Amino acid sequence: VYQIKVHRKYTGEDFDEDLRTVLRRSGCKNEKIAFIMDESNVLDSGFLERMNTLLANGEVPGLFEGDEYATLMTQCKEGAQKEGLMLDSHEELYKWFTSQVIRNLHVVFTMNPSSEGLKDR
């Protein structure tokens, strides 16, 4: 189980780093994770746009770039070597990471029964 510890200074990049961490913990580790979310933990619509991309694609390309992307490639390469799959190019390992996430990551959303908030969401 994983909850994001949200405070008043919990800006966008903090959640971005947290989502990078959970994506590393799910696909690169083949470790099934339950992602606990509440709307109280939400402070802006950017959170939900990024979750929308994640849910509809199984991954968000925005998180991983530059040195972070290379570290992801190293981690997914070592994970694939551990499981028994040999891949070299970036795209195949990225698709394998996406499959690992879509099979392991589980995102849950908790909301109070607000019909107006429901249609806004």
């Binding site: 510890k5 949200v6 405070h7 008043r8 919990y10 109280s40």
Partner: protein, 60 residues
């Protein structure tokens, strides 16, 4: 000030909470952990020991 109240167990009063800071969520939920003879609560990325004499009062 919240750290000082949690350390010394001193009562604390808040005059304005309309701009809520969710740091109090573990405190309000009383998410305490009993490790050894210590009572700890996580605040953000740092862990704090609780004193039973501590009490908080939020006001509007």
């Amino acid at each position: 000030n919240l750290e000082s109240a949690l350390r010394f167990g001193n009562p604390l009063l808040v005059q304005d909470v309309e701009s809520y800071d969710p740091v109090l969520n573990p405190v309000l939920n009383r998410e305490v952990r009993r490790t050894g003879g210590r009572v700890l609560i996580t605040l953000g990325d740092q862990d704090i020991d609780l004193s039973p004499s501590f009490v908080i009062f939020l006001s509007t």
